[PDB]
RNA sequence: AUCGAGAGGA
């Protein structure tokens, strides 16, 4: 916690590891914003983690459906 | 490309076992005969129990399981009875089943041994082996004064593939090449091993000289009967059952060949 | 050979020189390095903080 | 004492807990099996993001 | 809970064929006989009888799973012969062998009981 | 970003293959037209793999770069290894 | 320890520019493993020019285009004539050996201990063996491979 | 609790031999000679008779539920 | 010559196959690769 | 004919290193007509070989008396005239190595052909003149017969 | 519970895709207890199989072309060897050199390097087990084994 | 049903 929760990883990633209450309380006191870049934050919010099959987007090819 | 011409030599025939030798047959035929002795020779055994009253110290399934394992004389009746699968009757009928009744009550002060002698049948031909007219009767349960066991069983036709209670054998000794001439076994120290009862070797010689051109022939059998069938009836019924398995297989084979 | 002195002979072969090495029970890497006849190039420590 | 029939268990959309609407705990409660932190880490290493989302969002408490 | 009835090893399910013949395409003049509700008892004898036929090039059997209750017998014969014909002749030969063995065992029993 | 110069790999990643196959299989299962011919296939996954082998999956992979830009690759433009 | 390691590295990932980065988008490695290769495909191999002496290195890696009869044993007639006559080819082979000698010194500074065991993508000796068996190479007959073709 | 009916291994009937076995033991037979007298030659059936604990005799020390 | 050309193609293809895939969670993978052997090595 | 090599060998030693396998024995033999050493692995269980025995060895590329290639497949229902009829012990293997005393500049005066008969190994080494029929990854037969 | 997750698992997490681990660039699963003791006993030099035994074993090869191989011993009696059947098991045309655990260390120096008295020094060529006793070193989870080279 | 405690399995 003294090395991993002292970097700019975002409050939600840090609360997943250790010091859940202290981390979230510090983020509240300082108005920190989690950009939802890591896998922990997306996993908590039930969103597709930017990991493996989630590191890209798929688009439909209108010109090829013909 | 054709069948074997096996010969037979029976070396002992009692009411308890039959010891014989089959020569000039394949090992697969000998082992299929051995397997059919255990698993495809039908007999009669209790396979349905209705406990009307059981104050004994053994629960109902204990008594039922115990009754199922009592051997019933099946010699001439097993060929006549049908499988309840094949019977066109309801749950039961005298063509596919045999009714037993047991009704014992310990009123006296000494322990009452409910034995197989208390299994009363409707069919005189199918009775418990020990009850047949020495060896004592199989013990179903011991009862204390005031305890009572009243039940109604039905015995069916089946073989050992379905349940070991329909297995007629009390051991099938099977052997071949008593002197290790084919070297199908490899003794690290051949001198350490006892000689087979069928061995023909002088005591200095531990195993026969290796036979490169040899094949398993001369299979020795000791078919011990649990009591339901005579040992020779077990062997004859085994051969007949294996032959009918092959005949049914050939019938279905012919239908498949002609349907193509 | 992991602690021997591996040199390259004039013929181009790897040769493992069997030399004296010291193992201390404490660490003053700062001081030990700056000592006469002490190798300031291979002398190391297992205390990563130092 | 450890017979398989006292251990075998399966679940497909059974009861859920009151506080967090997630599957119950235990065979006796017809509960679901825990997809824990180590399973999350394993599937992150696999790179299976949709399976991870299915296990941690859609099969637990949408 | 999951125990199959013991008769399922011997009894055919409705609409299930006792034997099915499928042409093996890897090599010519080969067939696969999938026999349901049989086991090593018939497979071993049928295989070993087929091995006695010089027109049989391959004869083998397998129980693909012990918990399942079928066998597969692969038979390859010479081009002038057929695996179906080989299988038929093997069964015929086994039946004749068992009939002879039964008659000779009856004779041996009669001799033993008499003298 | 200049489509004339795409810096990402010309190969389809294992994750791209996985997600493209799953997506196209779901699309087929939801009655989307199939781009390849079919002998007797009724499983959407088999049809999607056949379309990928034929290089006839109408999907574009938008690969994001760390700087924020992106590169659009047609499934037919990538090299399918497995 | 396992949980701590996981929570410390969980979001580090290989990006589409092939850099390894964490959630903050900071760069941890410009290429994964310093070589941008996955750990499943690599395997143990030996650097053949690391341990040998200068004499052995010369004898095993310097293409000898002066011994006419040795070339006659290794190469076919047209290849032998082209190798012995042409000087452009001889200079190409000479620079090949110089480049291998420079590589030798680079390896000597990379592996200051004489350990030729390395982990690299393609098992070149196994691929060479595969090619020998796929094309039925006869090790006893002269080859039709031009050494200039090998260099190029 | 009670003598099994069959030998677990071969299926030989041992249920009718427990009482005879006990009667032979009180007749000053050794357990081996007693097992030989009953015809238990395979060590599986000898295991069945020799390792049996007649617990039913202890369960019959309790009065039944009904008189 | 045929064997050498095939060898060159094989080396190229296998090398391109050994390249790391974007989207590999190498950090979680490395944490697992370093923690799994830790469960076997001795405490004392 | 299809014969790569033929000679008469004399068993000079059996298992110098000791018996390694029970049913298999290694014979170190030498011929007289060509002065070729032979290491041979034989199944002594079915074809016992005693020290000092003398046998004719014939490495062949085919069993058919007429020049005709083999398919490497087992065909027991084959009625063609096979040269295995004239021999007692027959094995079927493949050449997996050919060594020699060649230098960078000189050809080989002595060769050493290695054959594996399904794991039973043979090394036939001697003058290179007698081992031109051997090529690596090529199937051969043993065709060995004992003589008095 | 979806085609997308099913495709994900089928293309990423299936066991055959999991044979080689990135942790140590070697197989993670290998041949194990009975199969390993038995393959060691099977590939010994004095393992000779009869025609019926060989057909029995070939029934259990899924990747069999249906061609019985020419036995290693034709006379006095046709006998196949265990290496001759494992050669049928071995896939493709892989090439591999290993050494059985009992390989003496002073054998690769003296003569008999390529004809091993102890049947050590595993050599697979073109997908045929030319020689050697297979063991943990050849079929286990170490690097450069037959299972690794097959993968 | 919840909470706790205890006993176990790998
Ligand atoms: Zn009826
Ligand atoms: Zn018994």
Q: How far apart are the C-alpha atoms of B159 and B36, rounded to whole Å? A: 9
D14-48 exposure pattern, b = at least 16 Cβ within 10 A, e = fewer: eeeeeeeeebbeeeeeebbeebeeeebbbbbbbbb
Three-class secondary structure of residue K141 per DSSP: coil
Would you call K95 and G43 a contact, using CB atoms and an 8 Å cutoff? no
B186 lies within 8 A of chain J by CB: yes
Residue D28, CA: closest nucleotide via C1'? L1
Spacing of H9 CA from L7 C1' in Å:
36
Measure the CA–CA gap between G15 and F13, rounded to whole angstroms. Answer: 12
- Record the tokens describing residue G14, joined without a space: 């290989």
Domain ranges of chain F: 1-82
The verdict on a CB contact (< 8 Å) between F8 and I22 is: yes
B177 and B156 within one domain: no
Query: Ligand 2 center to residue H43 CA distance, Å?
Result: 7
K58, K64 contact by CB (below 8 A): yes
Least Cα distance to F17 among A50, K7, G41 occurs for: K7
CA distance E60 to E43: 8
Number of domains observed in the structure of chain H: 1
Tokens read off for H37: 């007298």
By CB atoms closer than 10 A (0-12, 13-18, 19+), residue K29 is middle
What is the Cα–Cα distance from B233 to B227, expressed in whole angstroms? 11
Output the six-digit token pair for K7. 């495709």
- Every domain of chain E and the residues it spans: 1-115
Nearest alpha-carbon partner for H59 in B61, B108, B143, B53: B143
Give CA separation, A5 vs A11, A34, A45, I32, in Å.
8, 14, 20, 20
Q: State the helix-helix crossing angle for B231-259 and B27-39, rounded to 10 degrees.
A: 110
Q: How many CB atoms lie within 10 A of CB G113?
A: 11
Helix (H, G, I), strand (E, B) or coil at D18: coil
CA nearest to K23 within chain D: D45
> At which of B131, B164, B197 does a domain end?
B164
Residues B107 and B209 in one domain: no
Q: Is there a single domain that holds both residue B110 and residue B63?
A: yes
- Angle, CA J129 vertex, CA J126 and CA J132 arms, to 5°: 100
Specified resolution (Å): 2.8
3-state secondary structure of A41: helix
Q: Which helix (H) or strand (E) holds D51?
A: helix D49-53
Instruction: Encode G5-29: b = buried (16+ Cβ within 10 Å), e = exposed.
Output: bbbbbbbbbbbbbbbbbbbbeeeeb
* Structure tokens given for D26: 């235990």
Chosen for mutation from F13, F19, F66 (greatest number of chain I CBs closer than 10 Å) is F13
Do chains B and A meet with 3 or more Cβ pairs nearer than 8 Å? no
At what angle are helices E40-51 and K51-58 packed, to 10 degrees? 130
CA-based end-to-end distance of chain E: 56
Find chains touching chain E: ≥3 CB pairs under 8 Å: B, D, J, K
d(CA K24, CA K143): 8
CA of H14 from ligand 2 middle (Å) equals 8
Nearest to B71 by CA among B224, B259, B212: B224
Structural domains of chain K in order of their starting residue, each with its CATH number: 33-151 (1.10.274.100)
Q: Last residue of a domain, which of B164, B184, B212?
A: B164
H10 is in an annotated binding site: yes
The end-to-end CA distance of chain J, in Å, is 26
Q: Among residues K118, K145, K115, which one has the least CA distance to residue K130?
A: K115
Looking at the structure, tell me whether residues B12 and B37 fall in a common domain.
yes
Cβ-in-10-Å burial (0-12, 13-18, 19+) of B231 comes to: buried
Looking at the structure, do residues B74 and B184 belong to the same domain, yes or no?
no
User: 3-class DSSP state for residue E45?
Assistant: helix
User: Same domain for B183 and B240?
Assistant: yes
K76 contact residues in B (CB cutoff 8 A): 212
Which residues form the domain of B256?
1-42+165-260
First-to-final CA distance of chain C? 26
Phi, psi of G65 (to 5 degrees): -100, 15
Range of the domain at H6: 1-67
Q: Are strands J37-43 and K20-21 parallel, antiparallel or unpaired?
A: unpaired
CB contact under 8 A, K52 and E51: yes
Nucleotides of L under 7 A from a protein CB: 1-2, 9
Neighbour-count burial of J53, counting CB atoms closer than 10 A to its CB (0-12 exposed, 13-18 middle, 19+ buried): middle
Q: Which residues contact F42 (CB under 8 A, 6 or more apart)?
A: none
Q: Residue I24: list chain A partners with CB under 8 A.
A: 52
The first and second tokens of residue C15, run together, are 């040769």
H44 is in an annotated binding site: yes
Query: If you measure CA to C1', which residue is closest to nucleotide L10?
Result: D2
Is the domain of B214 the same as that of B204?
yes
Q: Which helix (H) or strand (E) holds B247?
A: helix B231-259
Q: Could you tell me if I28 lies within 8 Å of chain G, comparing CB atoms?
A: yes
Instruction: Return the ∠ at Cα B111 (arms to B105 and B115), rounded to 5°.
Output: 65
Q: Measured between alpha carbons, how far is residue C17 from residues C6, C14, G53, G104, K100 in Å?
A: 6, 10, 17, 21, 34
Rounded CA gap, A53 and F23, in Å? 11
Query: A21 φ, ψ to 5°?
Result: -70, -45
Residue B149's beta-bridge partner residues?
B54, B104
Method: cryo-EM
Instruction: Kindly state whether residues B58 and B144 are assigned to the same domain.
Output: yes
Chain F neighbours, 3+ Cβ pairs < 8 A: A, D, G, I, K
Q: Which residues contact J51 (CB under 8 A, 6 or more apart)?
A: J11, J12, J13, J14
Look up tokens 């074997």; give the residue: B4
The CA distance from K119 to K42, in Å, is 12
CA B200/CA E83 separation, integer angstroms: 42
- Which of F10, F64, F66, F69 would best serve as a mutation to test chain G binding (most G beta carbons within 10 A)? F66
DSSP letters, B104-146, are EE--SSSPEEEEGGG-EES-SSS-BTTT-----PPEEEEE-TT
Q: Tell me, yes or no, whether chains H and J touch by having 3 or more C-beta pairs under 8 A.
A: no
Is-contact E26 E46, C-beta < 8 A? no
**Stated in angstroms, how far is D15 CA from L6 C1'?**
27
By DSSP bridging, strand B112-115 and strand E56-62 are unpaired
Cα B34 to ligand 2 centroid, rounded to whole Å: 17
Q: Rounded to whole angstroms, what are the CA distances from F74 to F57, F62, H40?
A: 9, 9, 81
Chain E residue numbers with beta carbons less than 8 Å from the beta carbon of J75 are: 57
User: For nucleic chain L, which protein residues have CB less than 7 Å from any of its atoms?
Assistant: D 2, 17-18, 24, 28-29
d(CA G15, CA G25): 10
**Running DSSP on this structure, what letter comes out for residue E17?**
-
Cα H55 to chain centroid distance, Å, stands at 11
Do B116 and B224 sit in the same domain of this protein? no
Ligand 1 centroid distance, CA of B75 (Å): 19
Q: Can you spell out the DSSP letters for J24-65?
A: EEEEEEEESSS--EEEEEEETTTS---TT-EEEEEEES-SBS
């Amino acid at each position: 916690r003294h090395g991993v929760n002292r970097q700019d990883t975002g409050p939600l990633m840090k609360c997943s590891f250790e010091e859940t209450v202290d981390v979230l309380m510090e983020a509240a006191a300082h108005g920190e914003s989690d950009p939802m870049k890591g896998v922990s934050e997306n996993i908590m919010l039930g969103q597709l983690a930017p990991a493996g099959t989630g590191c890209f987007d798929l688009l439909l090819d209108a010109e090829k459906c013909k | 490309p054709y069948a074997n011409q096996p010969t037979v030599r029976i070396t002992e025939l009692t009411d308890e076992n039959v010891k014989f030798i089959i020569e000039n047959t394949d090992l697969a035929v000998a082992n299929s005969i051995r397997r059919v002795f255990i698993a495809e020779v039908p007999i009669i055994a209790i396979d349905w129990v209705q406990i009307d009253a059981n104050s004994s110290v053994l629960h109902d399934e204990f008594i039922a399981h115990r009754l199922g394992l009592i051997p019933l004389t099946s010699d001439d009746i097993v060929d006549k009875l049908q499988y309840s699968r094949d019977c066109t009757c309801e749950e039961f009928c005298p063509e596919c089943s045999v009714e037993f009744t047991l009704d014992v009550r310990c009123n006296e002060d000494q322990t009452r041994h409910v034995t197989s002698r208390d299994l009363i049948s409707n069919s005189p031909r199918v009775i418990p082996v020990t009850s047949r007219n020495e060896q004592d009767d199989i013990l179903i349960v011991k009862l204390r004064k005031g305890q009572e066991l009243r039940l109604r069983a039905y015995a069916k036709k089946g073989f050992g593939k379905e349940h070991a209670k329909w297995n007629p054998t009390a051991g099938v000794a099977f052997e071949y090449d008593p002197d290790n001439a084919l070297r199908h076994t490899v003794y690290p120290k051949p001198e350490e091993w006892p000689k087979s009862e069928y061995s023909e070797l002088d005591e200095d010689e531990s195993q026969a000289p290796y036979d490169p051109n040899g094949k398993p022939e001369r299979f020795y059998y000791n078919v011990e009967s649990c009591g339901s069938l005579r040992p020779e009836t077990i062997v004859l019924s085994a051969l007949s059952g294996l032959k009918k398995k092959l005949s049914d297989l050939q019938t279905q084979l012919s239908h498949e060949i002609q349907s193509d | 050979d992991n602690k021997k002195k591996i040199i390259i002979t004039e013929d181009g072969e790897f040769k493992a020189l069997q030399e004296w090495i010291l193992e201390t029970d404490g660490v003053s890497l700062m001081r030990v390095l700056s000592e006469k006849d002490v190798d300031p190039v291979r002398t190391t420590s297992n205390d990563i903080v130092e | 004492k450890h017979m398989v029939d006292d251990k075998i268990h399966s679940r497909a959309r059974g009861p859920i807990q009151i506080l967090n609407r997630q599957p119950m705990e235990g065979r006796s409660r017809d509960g679901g099996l825990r997809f824990g932190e180590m399973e999350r880490d394993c599937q992150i290493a696999h790179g299976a993001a949709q399976f991870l989302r299915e296990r941690l969002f859609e099969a637990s408490d949408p | 809970m999951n125990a199959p009835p013991a008769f399922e090893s011997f009894l055919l399910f409705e609409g299930e064929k006792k034997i099915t013949i499928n042409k093996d395409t890897k090599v010519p003049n080969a067939c696969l006989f999938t026999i349901n509700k049989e086991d090593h008892t018939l497979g071993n004898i049928i295989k070993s009888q087929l091995l006695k036929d010089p027109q049989v090039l391959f004869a083998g059997y397998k129980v693909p799973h012990p918990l399942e209750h079928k066998i597969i017998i692969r038979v390859q014969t010479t081009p002038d012969y057929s695996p179906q014909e080989a299988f038929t002749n093997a069964i015929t030969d086994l039946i004749s062998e068992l009939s002879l063995l039964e008659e000779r065992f009856r004779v041996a029993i009669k001799d033993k009981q008499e003298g | 970003q200049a489509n004339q110069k795409r810096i990402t790999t010309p190969y389809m990643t294992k994750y791209e293959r996985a997600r493209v196959l799953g997506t196209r299989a779901l699309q087929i299962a939801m009655c989307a037209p199939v781009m390849v011919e079919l002998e007797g296939e009724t499983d959407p996954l088999l049809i999607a793999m056949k379309e990928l082998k034929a290089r006839k999956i109408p999907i574009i992979i938008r690969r994001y770069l760390p700087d924020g830009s992106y590169e659009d690759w047609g499934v037919d433009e990538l090299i399918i290894s497995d | 320890i396992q949980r701590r390691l996981i929570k410390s590295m969980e979001s580090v990932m290989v990006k589409y520019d092939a850099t390894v980065r964490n959630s903050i988008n900071q760069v941890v490695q410009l290429r994964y493993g310093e070589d941008g290769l996955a750990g499943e495909s690599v395997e143990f191999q030996n650097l053949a020019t690391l341990k040998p002496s200068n004499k052995a290195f010369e004898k095993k890696f310097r293409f000898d285009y002066t011994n006419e009869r040795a070339l006659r044993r290794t190469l076919q007639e047209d290849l032998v004539k082209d190798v012995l006559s042409n000087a452009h080819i001889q200079n190409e082979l000479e620079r090949e050996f110089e480049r291998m000698r420079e590589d030798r010194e680079v390896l000597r500074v990379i592996f200051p201990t004489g350990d030729s065991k390395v982990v690299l993508p393609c098992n070149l000796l196994r691929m060479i063996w595969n090619a020998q068996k796929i094309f039925h190479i006869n090790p006893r007959l002269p080859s039709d491979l031009h050494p200039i073709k090998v260099v190029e | 609790m009670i003598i099994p009916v069959r030998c677990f291994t071969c299926g030989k009937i041992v249920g009718n031999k427990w009482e005879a076995y006990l009667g032979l033991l009180q007749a000053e037979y050794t357990e081996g000679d007693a097992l030989d007298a009953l015809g238990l030659k395979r060590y599986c059936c000898r295991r069945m008779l020799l390792a049996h604990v007649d617990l039913i005799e202890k369960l019959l020390n309790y009065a039944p539920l009904e008189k | 010559g045929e064997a050498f050309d095939w060898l060159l193609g094989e080396i190229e293809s296998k090398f391109n196959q050994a390249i790391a895939h974007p989207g590999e969670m190498v950090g979680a993978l490395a944490a697992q690769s370093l923690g799994e052997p830790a469960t076997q090595m001795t405490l004392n | 004919a299809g014969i790569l090599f033929e000679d008469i060998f004399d068993v000079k030693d059996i298992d110098p290193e000791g018996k390694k396998f029970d049913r298999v024995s290694r014979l170190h033999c030498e011929s007289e007509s060509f002065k070729m050493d032979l290491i041979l692995d034989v199944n002594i269980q079915i074809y016992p070989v005693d020290l000092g025995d003398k046998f004719r060895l014939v490495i062949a590329s085919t069993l058919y008396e007429d020049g005709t290639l083999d398919d490497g497949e087992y065909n027991p229902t084959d009625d063609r005239p096979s040269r295995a009829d004239q021999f007692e012990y027959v094995m079927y293997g493949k050449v997996y190595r050919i060594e020699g005393d060649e230098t960078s500049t000189e050809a080989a005066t002595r060769l050493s052909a290695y054959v594996s008969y399904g794991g039973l190994l043979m090394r036939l080494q001697g003058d290179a003149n007698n081992l031109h029929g051997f090529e690596v990854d090529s199937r051969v037969y043993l065709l060995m017969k004992k003589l008095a | 519970q979806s085609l997308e997750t099913r495709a994900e698992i089928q293309e990423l997490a299936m066991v055959p895709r999991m044979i080689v681990t990135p942790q140590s660039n070697r197989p993670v699963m290998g041949i194990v207890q009975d199969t390993l003791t038995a393959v060691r006993k099977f590939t010994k030099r004095d393992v000779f199989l009869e025609r019926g035994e060989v057909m029995n074993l070939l029934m259990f090869l899924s990747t069999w072309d249906g061609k019985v191989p020419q036995p290693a011993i034709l006379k006095p009696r046709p006998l196949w060897t265990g290496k001759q059947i494992f050669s049928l098991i071995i896939p493709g045309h892989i090439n591999c050199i290993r050494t059985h655990s009992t390989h003496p260390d002073d054998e690769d120096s003296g003569p008999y390097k390529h004809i091993s008295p102890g049947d050590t020094k595993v050599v697979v060529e073109n997908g045929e087990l030319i020689m050697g006793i297979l063991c943990k070193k050849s079929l286990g989870t170490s690097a450069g084994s037959l299972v690794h080279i097959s993968y």
